[PDB]
Design an enzyme around this catalytic site. Structure first.
Site, mmCIF file in Angstrom:
data_model
loop_
_atom_site.group_PDB
_atom_site.id
_atom_site.type_symbol
_atom_site.label_atom_id
_atom_site.label_comp_id
_atom_site.label_asym_id
_atom_site.label_seq_id
_atom_site.Cartn_x
_atom_site.Cartn_y
_atom_site.Cartn_z
ATOM 1 N N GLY A 190 45.019 41.649 29.338
ATOM 2 C CA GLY A 190 46.238 40.885 29.106
ATOM 3 C C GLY A 190 46.777 41.156 27.714
ATOM 4 O O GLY A 190 46.219 41.938 26.946
ATOM 5 N N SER A 191 47.876 40.468 27.377
ATOM 6 C CA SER A 191 48.597 40.865 26.185
ATOM 7 C C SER A 191 47.879 40.499 24.903
ATOM 8 O O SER A 191 47.943 41.245 23.944
ATOM 9 C CB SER A 191 50.021 40.302 26.242
ATOM 10 N N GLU B 39 44.809 40.768 24.442
ATOM 11 C CA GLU B 39 43.639 41.654 24.392
ATOM 12 C C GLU B 39 44.032 43.120 24.105
ATOM 13 O O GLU B 39 43.165 43.900 23.789
ATOM 14 C CB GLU B 39 42.851 41.563 25.725
ATOM 15 N N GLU C 10 39.620 37.347 37.753
ATOM 16 C CA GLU C 10 38.555 37.160 36.763
ATOM 17 C C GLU C 10 37.241 36.628 37.324
ATOM 18 O O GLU C 10 36.186 36.908 36.775
ATOM 19 C CB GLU C 10 39.009 36.247 35.634
ATOM 20 N N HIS D 73 41.698 37.323 29.709
ATOM 21 C CA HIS D 73 42.978 36.975 29.090
ATOM 22 C C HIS D 73 43.080 35.460 28.866
ATOM 23 O O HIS D 73 43.354 34.710 29.812
ATOM 24 C CB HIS D 73 44.153 37.434 29.990
ATOM 25 N N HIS E 41 17.879 20.263 46.942
ATOM 26 C CA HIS E 41 19.258 20.164 47.377
ATOM 27 C C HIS E 41 19.463 18.953 48.289
ATOM 28 O O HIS E 41 20.132 17.977 47.922
ATOM 29 C CB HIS E 41 19.799 21.460 48.015
ATOM 30 N N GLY F 157 25.223 27.858 43.805
ATOM 31 C CA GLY F 157 25.808 27.642 45.117
ATOM 32 C C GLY F 157 27.283 27.977 45.101
ATOM 33 O O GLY F 157 27.989 27.676 46.087
HETATM 34 C C1 LIG Z 1 45.158 35.206 35.162
HETATM 35 C C2 LIG Z 1 45.822 36.342 34.351
HETATM 36 N N1 LIG Z 1 45.109 37.452 34.113
HETATM 37 C C3 LIG Z 1 45.708 38.432 33.380
HETATM 38 C C4 LIG Z 1 46.958 38.286 32.828
HETATM 39 C C5 LIG Z 1 47.459 39.441 31.954
HETATM 40 N N2 LIG Z 1 48.768 39.988 32.351
HETATM 41 C C6 LIG Z 1 49.983 39.568 31.852
HETATM 42 C C7 LIG Z 1 50.270 38.905 30.512
HETATM 43 O O1 LIG Z 1 49.196 38.798 29.633
HETATM 44 C C8 LIG Z 1 51.533 38.676 29.910
HETATM 45 C C9 LIG Z 1 52.428 37.821 30.428
HETATM 46 C C10 LIG Z 1 53.699 37.457 29.933
HETATM 47 C C11 LIG Z 1 54.004 37.118 28.608
HETATM 48 C C12 LIG Z 1 55.333 36.737 28.356
HETATM 49 C C13 LIG Z 1 56.261 36.667 29.411
HETATM 50 N N3 LIG Z 1 55.912 36.980 30.677
HETATM 51 C C14 LIG Z 1 54.658 37.361 30.941
HETATM 52 S S1 LIG Z 1 51.299 40.409 32.686
HETATM 53 C C15 LIG Z 1 50.133 41.314 33.634
HETATM 54 C C16 LIG Z 1 50.608 42.365 34.613
HETATM 55 C C17 LIG Z 1 51.229 41.825 35.928
HETATM 56 O O2 LIG Z 1 51.559 43.030 36.710
HETATM 57 P P1 LIG Z 1 52.490 42.899 37.948
HETATM 58 O O3 LIG Z 1 52.354 41.594 38.656
HETATM 59 O O4 LIG Z 1 52.287 44.167 38.760
HETATM 60 O O5 LIG Z 1 53.939 42.897 37.376
HETATM 61 P P2 LIG Z 1 54.749 43.985 36.392
HETATM 62 O O6 LIG Z 1 54.328 45.389 36.815
HETATM 63 O O7 LIG Z 1 56.193 43.701 36.628
HETATM 64 O O8 LIG Z 1 54.305 43.632 34.973
HETATM 65 C C18 LIG Z 1 48.837 40.922 33.320
HETATM 66 C C19 LIG Z 1 47.593 41.495 34.025
HETATM 67 C C20 LIG Z 1 47.597 37.065 33.061
HETATM 68 N N4 LIG Z 1 48.768 36.777 32.537
HETATM 69 N N5 LIG Z 1 47.014 36.124 33.806
HETATM 70 C C1 LIG Z 2 33.320 27.951 45.344
HETATM 71 C C2 LIG Z 2 32.796 27.174 46.573
HETATM 72 N N1 LIG Z 2 33.682 26.508 47.329
HETATM 73 C C3 LIG Z 2 33.194 25.815 48.396
HETATM 74 C C4 LIG Z 2 31.850 25.719 48.665
HETATM 75 C C5 LIG Z 2 31.452 24.830 49.849
HETATM 76 N N2 LIG Z 2 30.613 25.495 50.861
HETATM 77 C C6 LIG Z 2 29.234 25.491 50.868
HETATM 78 C C7 LIG Z 2 28.293 24.468 50.246
HETATM 79 O O1 LIG Z 2 28.888 23.340 49.689
HETATM 80 C C8 LIG Z 2 26.893 24.346 50.440
HETATM 81 C C9 LIG Z 2 26.028 25.276 50.010
HETATM 82 C C10 LIG Z 2 24.619 25.283 50.089
HETATM 83 C C11 LIG Z 2 23.767 24.215 49.777
HETATM 84 C C12 LIG Z 2 22.389 24.468 49.881
HETATM 85 C C13 LIG Z 2 21.931 25.750 50.235
HETATM 86 N N3 LIG Z 2 22.791 26.756 50.503
HETATM 87 C C14 LIG Z 2 24.108 26.536 50.427
HETATM 88 S S1 LIG Z 2 28.636 26.505 52.192
HETATM 89 C C15 LIG Z 2 30.284 26.842 52.688
HETATM 90 C C16 LIG Z 2 30.544 27.689 53.916
HETATM 91 C C17 LIG Z 2 30.304 29.212 53.745
HETATM 92 O O2 LIG Z 2 30.669 29.798 55.046
HETATM 93 P P1 LIG Z 2 30.255 31.263 55.361
HETATM 94 O O3 LIG Z 2 30.225 32.142 54.156
HETATM 95 O O4 LIG Z 2 31.119 31.700 56.531
HETATM 96 O O5 LIG Z 2 28.773 31.181 55.835
HETATM 97 P P2 LIG Z 2 28.042 30.298 57.057
HETATM 98 O O6 LIG Z 2 29.000 30.278 58.244
HETATM 99 O O7 LIG Z 2 26.769 31.022 57.333
HETATM 100 O O8 LIG Z 2 27.813 28.913 56.454
HETATM 101 C C18 LIG Z 2 31.189 26.228 51.832
HETATM 102 C C19 LIG Z 2 32.715 26.383 51.974
HETATM 103 C C20 LIG Z 2 30.993 26.379 47.780
HETATM 104 N N4 LIG Z 2 29.685 26.313 47.892
HETATM 105 N N5 LIG Z 2 31.483 27.080 46.756
#
Ligand SMILES: Cc1ncc(C[n+]2c([C@@H](O)/C=C/c3cccnc3)sc(CCOP(=O)(O)OP(=O)(O)O)c2C)c(N)n1
Ligand SMILES: Cc1ncc(C[n+]2c([C@@H](O)/C=C/c3cccnc3)sc(CCOP(=O)(O)OP(=O)(O)O)c2C)c(N)n1
Ligand SMILES: Cc1ncc(C[n+]2c([C@@H](O)/C=C/c3cccnc3)sc(CCOP(=O)(O)OP(=O)(O)O)c2C)c(N)n1
Ligand SMILES: [Mg+2]
Ligand SMILES: [Mg+2]
Ligand SMILES: [Mg+2]
EC number: 4.1.1.7
Lengths: 525, 525, 525
Positions: B24-25, B27, B46, B69, B280, B400
């Site tokens: 990002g900008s 960085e 990320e 970023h 758990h 988890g």
């Molecule tokens: C969560 C996240 N991660 C990374 C960035 C860094 N970043 C960005 C920034 O750090 C800067 C953002 C900015 C600053 C001022 C005004 N408008 C935007 S822009 C960017 C590229 C996006 O590419 P794309 O969607 O293909 O469009 P363009 O080709 O038209 O530019 C990135 C990667 C970000 N802003 N957010």
């Molecule tokens: C970031 C994130 N978001 C949501 C959850 C909640 N969650 C989970 C949990 O809250 C529980 C996790 C757990 C607890 C004990 C042991 N192992 C796992 S499991 C789950 C479903 C995943 O489905 P899939 O990958 O298709 O596999 P299965 O069909 O074999 O189960 C979800 C959604 C999570 N664990 N993490």
């Protein structure tokens, strides 16, 4: 009554009827027996959940309710919370905690030090000390999100709390009405009106809290009365004014020196509903030139405190814009003249210039379309080229965090079923929250996604040029087939490699009954 | 020297040669003039950046360096940090900040209260008070991540700092060696050895810090000497022991009563490299039964403090396992007998039982394969059915948090180019970090992704059954075409709807020269 | 059993028998039915409570237990916690919270966001999620305070929790033994020993963790073996070595350039039990000169990480000092020669020079006296002029926070009833915690307080001179009658305006059966 039944009663009595969520095991006791008058909107990753809820809250102008899984689910949503903080979005984020008997040992899925996890991106963050406190805590969360300056809040609830008995005195929570609809006292408002009436060359600068308040029409009356040019404050997350009104000047460049130069010769600059100012690039100079003074109306004490210049008034934007628009004199000065239309950029039969894409969208979209921007290198052209007559017509990630527009466009379309949403998203930005597409397919929310494919992170190539920075890695994103990603998640997909195909693809998308993704081949910078 | 040149010198002198990032900008001033001896691994979101770095650090047993970023980039990575905290992964997370002249006004992309953002998921979090301090801060981050108990750290750097002059005294940072390779003092270690030698029926329980320390072979010698059964501690993020060794007992159920019952009749239980315990499910009962005492060796004071029972020793797992394995007597008791092979589940010519998938993987994968699990409803069967002879052969999201295994499998494959990585990921889990696939395609990292497609969040249907919870929304995930998602990101894709097609698809993937995704139609629960 | 009964059982079984406190209403349910085998030591303000407990813990080398009132009581103790953090003092700070039914409404005496209040000055800070968790939380607090690197911890307990039923499984907490008594593995310790054996001109630098570990005698053997000069690390909170041993060099100046110059020509500098280094004044230069390398043994990863130079080993100071002292070769070099005695400063029949006061104390105090310093402008002279042969003979506020020595000297005297404690405290410093005197009177703890009365904040006049800072307000403290303050709190008081009266007053104080305060008229700087 149980804590579960009392809590869903509180939510419905406070106008909440929708849960945006990605479920997990600590949340099943909350989600069971889900009430028949509520809806649950599933998304596949938590940045998508929160982005959908955020577009829905911003477009509906009311709080949205989210349910996430413990620490990992909350953590996956924290980039989305960074944008919601900057847009003042009223989001009630709840996350399930382990059962209270398992928290001490730090069982798997315990959210350790939970209330600190989402800080500093929330107004209020809390875990109740007992089950019976949960409804009261939920009431605090609703009002903290909803009072000015609106913003996200966080509540963590141990899963065993929901089946416990509620306190019968919790009924007093259900119908509480809390208002922050306030304006400057009469005497001081009269002083402000006289200063506006007396200015020889006033200018008006509007930010996103104007659109949030639906104060847009009052700001048009105010600008017509004062005969004043109107700019949108820099790094704009929303559009606060009709972009073809004669007073409209456009988006301010996000630089200190650029803004003072733009304002030079204006004696009084009235800023409404914006930080002063959300600069971005390094552009040192004077905050204001000699002869210009600034007055800011903001709903956020943190904005008033940090402005490097000007006077400020902390108050509700709706109430203040209405009072000013109805109190100021009609100036005898001539009304500003409308900016001229942008020029047509030369376009051959190959890859599309962004300018061509926005002119074509403007030609073909309905007059009540809603646009979303996450095409970072093309923002200036988008603001010049789209006629947005109505409120609630533009959104752009308020903290610059990519992964907002794709999900948010689904939430906005859910909030505004009769207004066509069109999200214009770069090929880089499209990946951050790509799985949100599945929610538009599953619920048949007919958002149109226009992916600007130029193969690179174009805005970063631009900023690298400004810095004169060479040999930067990681700037190219070749090899992504957006038609295949849309197929993966069940969304109809079209490709436009030239203007003829862009027009055809837009006519087909505009006629479709479900969400559509169009991959547009745009010119490389 | 500049702060930029001094910092990359410090990194190389401390063994760091790879930056995992999404740029990002703020960085670009760090990433410009990127040194020719470093590599940059781009990922598109990320959570993917951090998951790749985390698999790389865990498999390489050394710190990994990440660049994100500002606040939004850091926030999008916070679910990944929740897993890295629980796995003790040595991650150095850096994020760019606005230029110092722009921080006060809170310009766009300012990371407000930056050091608080990633808490409580980091060991140390900091923003330096001046440019010249950056190399020293970076040194602190490297050693905080790397000292026992290892874990993630966070450093925020204003973008203007990199081009400033460095302090010439920063050279003293470059070659610092910091050790936490310690073990219990002689007198007390002799007391512990005599207790082990004297036990009539010892048991051994191993956690993930054993695999992290590469203490696996020493733990095999220890278990052979004591003639003791070996279990893996519950909610296991790594595999610490060969799963077909005669002493091996398997994965412990994650319940209080289940574990005390399993340990009943064992007089001394020695736990090495695990929390006591990562339970758990709700399963109340006795922590230990009468007649069993527990002794824990842990590298983490927070683990020692929170154990509800037993004695503890806080020390390096490598050093303690080596000393115990070489000091204990060879018991005259008979060596435990190997568990029998699992049974073949009946399989028709239709959709696959998970048991069939793991038996087939075990039949066809190389003996030095590395597996990753994010198929949440099938973990018990996976642990029974895969013969993992070698260290570093298993990873499962330690907190988890879903979205770990897909990116982590790419990092593990980058760390271990000669060991075939096979990630077994549910259709639900696959979405959280789906865009990581693009990094495997772009860099040609030949991970194999096996997607278990049963249409639902199966583990949540299971937990809902245990709770007897009805009318829970959001549990089904129909309508995802994983072959199309793989095409979208440039990865070869195969589908297996039955056993014949599973075998064919695995033979093709195992022979391929690049990453492969196989969508397997598995039986609905 | 109740939570109250289970908690006091846990405390007694973990060796805790004393509560240092200032009571309040949220604590009465904890303090009622106070057990007959415990003692309660009351002080009148919370900086005094904590300072007394801190002197007691440092001198006893075991944790001390504190009970304070909610947020205000905890807040009044936070300057004392700053010193306890820097001295690694094992303090268990508990504070009462409102009843859980009253926390949501934020009733008076609710400690809001309690676990965040004492951060960043504590190792662990917590409020349990239920009553039954309190004993387990208390167990975590005891072990977090007691494990290396020792330090303060904080636990907040709602007042209604104490009368609830305890979990019967809490008995497993009572006898847990947790050890951090570790040392570097054999192979690496042999490398370190060979480096020491091979050095041509080694130097040794010792910090306060040596005295805390009672590693002093082992460090004397180590210095005799290596024939090496010994310095105390700068800003010294404790004394780690006999100050008339032939190897002793004194207190290091707290400056970067001063220390590198002092170490010039020493090829290997071994630092034990200190930060590297607790500099104070601005004194830029080289961290080390060419030809000197540094090796640090520290019990604190935060110290190892932040050292700007040298190698480090993170381990227990007692175990490492014992192993090194017993493994190193006896060098054939000549033993260092003892520093000469300090000179007598000319003294007329008027106000006392500080040098005269310390020479007279040294002449008249027992050889096992314990000294405390909070006479900020006289520290260099005190370190030259007092022969401290024994461990545990010196304390000085480790974070520079005044208000430590007066209360701490009462705690030290309580810990060491047979060693005469003599606190030497400036007239400015004496005020910060003046009410602590009442605790010495009430319990008849026979500390002697020597107040150095020069009318001014002398050290600040010194630092103002270094800065060349003129017109600084607030530096003078005339008009305080310390004899009257001592009378106010029940302590016998004497005045010494010249040397004859100093000698008489000291002979009377040394003969007294209770605490004595002597006001000494010292020369104005
Ligand atoms: C969560 C996240 N991660 C990374 C960035 C860094 N970043 C960005 C920034 O750090 C800067 C953002 C900015 C600053 C001022 C005004 N408008 C935007 S822009 C960017 C590229 C996006 O590419 P794309 O969607 O293909 O469009 P363009 O080709 O038209 O530019 C990135 C990667 C970000 N802003 N957010
Ligand atoms: C970031 C994130 N978001 C949501 C959850 C909640 N969650 C989970 C949990 O809250 C529980 C996790 C757990 C607890 C004990 C042991 N192992 C796992 S499991 C789950 C479903 C995943 O489905 P899939 O990958 O298709 O596999 P299965 O069909 O074999 O189960 C979800 C959604 C999570 N664990 N993490
Ligand atoms: C809680 C608190 N408040 C203020 C200070 C600031 N301060 C102090 C400091 O900011 C500096 C401390 C320092 C720094 C390095 C080494 N030693 C001490 S010293 C001081 C005056 C104390 O006067 P007195 O006790 O009469 O002794 P001297 O006449 O011999 O100096 C003050 C006021 C402080 N250190 N702590
Ligand atoms: Mg692009
Ligand atoms: Mg599934
Ligand atoms: Mg003084």
């Amino acid at each position: 009554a149980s804590v579960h039944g009392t809590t869903y009663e509180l939510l419905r009595r406070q106008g909440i009827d929708t849960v945006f969520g990605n479920p997990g095991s600590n949340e099943l006791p909350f989600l069971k027996d889900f009430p028949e008058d509520f809806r649950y909107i599933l998304a596949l990753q938590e940045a998508c959940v929160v982005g959908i809820a955020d577009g829905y809250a911003q477009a509906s102008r009311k709080p949205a309710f989210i349910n996430l899984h413990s620490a990992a689910g909350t953590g996956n949503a924290m980039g989305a919370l960074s944008n919601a903080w900057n847009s003042h979005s009223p989001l009630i984020v709840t996350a399930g905690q382990q059962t209270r008997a398992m928290i001490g040992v730090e069982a798997l899925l315990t959210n350790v030090d939970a209330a600190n996890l989402p800080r500093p991106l929330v107004k209020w963050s809390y875990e109740p000390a007992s089950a019976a406190e949960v409804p009261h805590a939920m009431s605090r969360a609703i009002h903290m999100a909803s009072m000015a300056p609106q913003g996200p809040v966080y509540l963590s609830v141990p899963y065993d709390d929901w089946d416990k008995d509620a306190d019968p005195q919790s009924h007093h929570l259900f119908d509480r009405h809390v208002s922050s609809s306030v304006r400057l006292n009469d005497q001081d408002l009269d002083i402000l009106v006289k200063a506006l009436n007396s200015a020889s060359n006033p200018a008006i600068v509007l930010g996103p809290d104007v659109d949030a308040a639906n104060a847009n029409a009052d700001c048009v009356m105010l600008a017509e009365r004062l005969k004043a040019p109107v700019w949108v404050a820099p790094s704009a997350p929303r559009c606060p004014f009709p972009t073809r009104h004669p007073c409209f000047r456009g988006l301010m460049p996000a630089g200190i020196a650029a803004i003072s130069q733009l304002l030079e010769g204006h004696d009084v600059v009235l800023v409404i509903g914006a930080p002063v100012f959300r600069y971005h690039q390094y552009d040192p100079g004077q905050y204001l030139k000699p002869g210009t003074r600034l007055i800011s109306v903001t709903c956020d004490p943190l904005e008033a405190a940090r402005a490097p210049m000007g006077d400020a008034i902390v108050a509700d934007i709706g109430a203040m814009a209405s009072a000013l628009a109805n109190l100021v004199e009609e100036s005898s000065r001539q009304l500003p003249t409308a900016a001229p239309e942008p020029a047509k950029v030369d376009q051959d039969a190959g890859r599309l210039h962004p300018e061509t894409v926005f002119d074509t969208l403007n030609d073909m979209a309905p007059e009540n379309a809603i646009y979303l921007n996450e095409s970072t290198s093309t923002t200036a052209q988008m603001w010049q080229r789209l006629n947005m007559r109505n409120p609630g017509s533009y959104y752009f990630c308020a903290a610059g965090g990519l992964g907002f527009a794709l999900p948010a466009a689904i939430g906005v379309q859910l909030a505004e079923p009769e207004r066509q949403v069109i999200a214009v998203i770069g090929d880089g930005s499209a990946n951050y929250s790509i799985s949100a597409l599945w929610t538009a397919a599953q619920y048949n929310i007919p958002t149109i996604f226009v992916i600007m494919n130029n193969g690179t992170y174009g805005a970063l190539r631009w900023f690298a040029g400004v810095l004169e920075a060479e040999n930067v890695p990681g700037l190219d994103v070749p090899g992504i087939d957006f038609r295949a990603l849309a197929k993966g998640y069940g969304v109809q997909a079209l490709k436009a490699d030239n203007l003829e195909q862009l027009k055809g693809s837009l006519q087909e998308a505009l006629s479709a009954k479900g969400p559509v993704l169009i991959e547009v081949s745009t010119v490389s910078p």
